[PDB]
């Protein structure tokens, strides 16, 4: 805003509230919000499973 540095080359997503203030370019990556949760355990099917 107050012209301190020209570019903003960083993970700076294109959102609605930022576009009305600064000017982005067109994308170089494509995002999407998603969930990072743990993978479940292992069951270790034993040799005496019968």
Partner 1 sequence: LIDSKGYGVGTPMGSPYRDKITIAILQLQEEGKLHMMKEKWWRGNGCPEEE
Ligand X SMILES: CCCCCCCC/C=C\CCCCCCCC(=O)O[C@@H](COC(=O)CCCCCCCCCCCCCCC)COP(=O)([O-])OCC[N+](C)(C)C
**Binding stretches for a second copy (CB under 8 A):** 14, 24, 26-27, 30
- The residue count for the chain: 50
Give the span between the Cα atoms of 18 and 23, in whole angstroms: 8
Site for ligand X in 28-47 (CB under 6 A): 45-47
At 40 the three-state DSSP class reads coil
How many other C-beta atoms can be found within 10 angstroms of the C-beta atom of residue 18?
13
38 is in an annotated binding site: no
Instruction: Say if residue 18 carries a ligand binding annotation.
Output: yes
Nearer to ligand X, 28 or 48 (CB): 48
Question: Binding site: residue ranges?
Answer: 11, 13, 18
């Amino acid at each position: 805003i107050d012209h301190k540095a020209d570019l903003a080359v960083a993970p700076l997503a294109i959102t609605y509230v930022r576009e009305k203030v600064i000017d982005f370019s067109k994308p170089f990556m494509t995002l999407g919000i998603s969930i990072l949760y743990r993978k479940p355990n292992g069951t270790n099917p034993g040799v005496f499973s019968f």
